[PDB]
Amino acid sequence: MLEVCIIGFGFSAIPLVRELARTQTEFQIISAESGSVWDRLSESGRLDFSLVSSFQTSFYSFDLVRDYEKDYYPTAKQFYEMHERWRSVYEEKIIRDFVTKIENFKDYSLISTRSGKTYEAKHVVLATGFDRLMNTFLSNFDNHVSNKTFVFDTMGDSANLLIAKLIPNNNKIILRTNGFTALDQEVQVLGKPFTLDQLESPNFRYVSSELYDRLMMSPVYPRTVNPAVSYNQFPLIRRDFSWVDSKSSPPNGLIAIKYWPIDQYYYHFNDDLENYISKGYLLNDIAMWLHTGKVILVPSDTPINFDKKTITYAGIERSFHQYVKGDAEQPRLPTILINGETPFEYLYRDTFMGVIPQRLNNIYFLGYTRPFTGGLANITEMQSLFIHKLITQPQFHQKIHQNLSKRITAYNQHYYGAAKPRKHDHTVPFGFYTEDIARLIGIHYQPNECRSVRDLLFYYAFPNNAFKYRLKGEYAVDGVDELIQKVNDKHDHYAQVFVQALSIRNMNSDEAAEWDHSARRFAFNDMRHKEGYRAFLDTYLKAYRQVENISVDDTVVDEEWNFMVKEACQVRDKVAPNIYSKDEDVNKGIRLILSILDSDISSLPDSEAQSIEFIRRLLQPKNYELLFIR
Ligand SMILES: Cc1cc2nc3c(=O)[nH]c(=O)nc-3n(C[C@H](O)[C@H](O)[C@H](O)COP(=O)(O)OP(=O)(O)OC[C@H]3O[C@@H](n4cnc5c(N)ncnc54)[C@H](O)[C@@H]3O)c2cc1C
Ligand SMILES: N[C@@H](Cc1c[nH]c2ccccc12)C(=O)O
Ligand SMILES: N[C@@H](Cc1c[nH]c2ccccc12)C(=O)O
């Protein structure tokens, strides 16, 4: 009887296959001849874009230990080349066929295929990814479209990439949406670049709910009155968050687009622009699009005629070339039959950690948990360890399964509360999920085992990337010691992030929101850093057109668009003329922290002074309990 069948092999399955090979666990992979969207994109020469996620969060530990030198955003080409390199390693273990049906029995499954070949396996892992409406726009994308009006009903990373590609052809862009959360993918800390995933310090949730809520939520929830922030200048960007019924923030189910702010884009790419564009570094600054009117927001119920293909806004009846109905992702699951008869019904919340379904025996889901920020790699690497342990260690399998239903209820209570299921329930803060799995497996760190201030920075401020949990113990990867060292040396041991928590520990939510926006450049959607880059934008558009052999007349003036922008930007044309604690507090804080790096915590003196009380309390956080684990 085959011990393990893995169904689907692209990106998610890679770390699990690595661990099964290491422990010489008998396994077979079944994966479609057709491959993935990355194959559609490769074949048709449209791997001409870049990830919305950092190298550190997007490649697996066992690659980073070799290949990490600096933080950067990988290209689509680099991500695909890495899939292909791992496929080549394991191709002999891959049967090229398509699973049509799985019949699940008490201790095995029967797997049916398009060819007709059937397989029996004790343990079955699904790593088949998602179907996505929007993939055709990307894979079949036509750039000879010019001066046309596009209407999007949803903002997501796919819409943002499409928009990035349309705008340089003077395509006009209308978003008819119920608001969206956009976040600069790279930010300044005292004029050094940090990818946003570097600044989440998620284990601060263990100090308290309320404290972590203040570290994180002012850029998302409409909390500051600062007229510089995109959600004040363009309030149609705001959302109905009335659904949120959890003290865990950011909540499970929050999705965000990560985008290049034009100032950071300029800093990286100004000096070899055309070459950086051809590599896939595309300017996708939605905030700059709103600023410049290249995109407009209209209310969610701005009526439109689908027969005449018209949107009417103010007094112009705008004909549109295309309505984009907005991305929805659904797992590519074959039919699964409970005791080989009753269709399994898939729902994220009814699975433990997005991995273990109820009423199935020895079936696991790998790659169906989506990270709020950072790459999928963080999520699938930890899921792969979790699955590997469940398959290979009956003691662990029994420990998790014995109370599976209670664990799932306690997880759902903690992260969703009373909210009804939503299509984005599968979206999680990466540094809660990785930590959650680490504590289930037992490869977590204990806060009480911190000895020095250096140790508290590593526990609380060092990002919860999967490789954090592969330094020592059961899943240790060779070279993680040197990788952690490089990362720490290049980011001042995450002292800046740590002193953010020190600065706001005494503030209420309104005070922390004001302080967040008191910077010369606050982290996200700072509309003061847009006007200065108008000339660079024109250089960018001409560089984009040069790389993609486009010609269009800006001497040709779409006078109708110019008119609808005015109407859309009315709140902005009032709010912006009304336009630095954080910078100074962080500057002072870092100096203090970097000065006591190697000081013993437990022995730090009594009697700032209460910032020492606080630092000593970090050995005994009071919100450490997670009832789906204990
Ligand atoms: C446009 C785009 C951009 C993305 N950008 C990023 C990014 O910036 N950062 C990031 O971290 N992630 C990104 N992702 C998400 C994620 O990394 C990809 O979706 C990735 O391909 C997921 O890998 P996977 O292995 O889960 O699924 P896939 O890569 O889709 O591989 C699954 C494989 O299973 C096969 N298969 C499916 N069903 C069956 C079956 N029944 N039988 C046999 N074989 C089957 C498929 O043919 C496929 O080859 C992006 C996704 C898309 C679409
Ligand atoms: N804590 C950092 C970074 C940050 C806040 N909210 C976020 C949401 C997602 C990612 C990063 C962040 C800050 O206050 O600026
Ligand atoms: N185009 C993809 C992007 C994506 C999916 N999952 C991700 C995880 C991390 C980063 C990007 C993604 C989508 O939004 O459907």
Author numbering: 1 to 579, 585 to 612, 631 to 653
Article sentences:
The first documented single-component Trp-FDH is AetF from cyanobacterium *Aetokthonos hydrillicola*, which catalyzes consecutively bromination on C5 and then C7 of Trp to generate 5,7-di-Br-Trp. More recently, a class of “single-component” FDHs has been identified. These enzymes fuse pyridine nucleotide-dependent flavin reductase and FDH on the same polypeptide chain, an advantageous feature in the application aspect relative to canonical FDHs owing to the omission of including a flavin reductase. The action of FDHs requires the reduced flavin and molecular oxygen to generate hydroperoxyl flavin intermediate, which oxidizes a halide ion to form a halogenating reagent hypohalous acid (HOX). The flipping allows the carbon-to-be-halogenated to be oriented toward the catalytic residue K258 and within the hydrogen bond distance to the putative general base E200, such that the halogenation site on two substrates is switched from C5 to C7.
When conducting Ala substitution to investigate the role of the substrate-binding residues in our previous study, we found that substituting S523, a residue that binds the carboxyl group of the substrate, to Ala leads to 2.5-fold increase in 5-Br-Trp production and very low di-brominated product. Before conducting engineering, the crystal structure of AetF-S523A in complex with Trp was resolved (**[Table tbl1]**). The electron density maps corresponding to Trp were clearly observed in the substrate-binding pocket (**[Fig fig1]**). The binding pose and the interaction network of Trp to the enzyme are identical to those of the wild type enzyme (**[Fig fig1]**). This indicates that removing S523-mediated polar interaction poses minimal influence to the binding of Trp. Noteworthily, we failed to obtain the complex structure of AetF-S523A and 5-Br-Trp despite of great efforts, which should be attributed to the low affinity of the variant enzyme to the compound. This also indicates that the S523-mediated interaction is crucial to the binding of 5-Br-Trp, such that the Ala substitute is incapable of accepting the substrate that shows a flipped pose relative to Trp and displays low dibrominated Trp production activity as previously proposed. It should be noted that AetF-S523A still produces trace amounts of 5,7-di-Br-Trp (**[Fig fig1]**). AetF-S523A, a variant that was identified in our previous study, exhibits around 3.9 % activity to produce di-brominate Trp compared with the wild type enzyme.
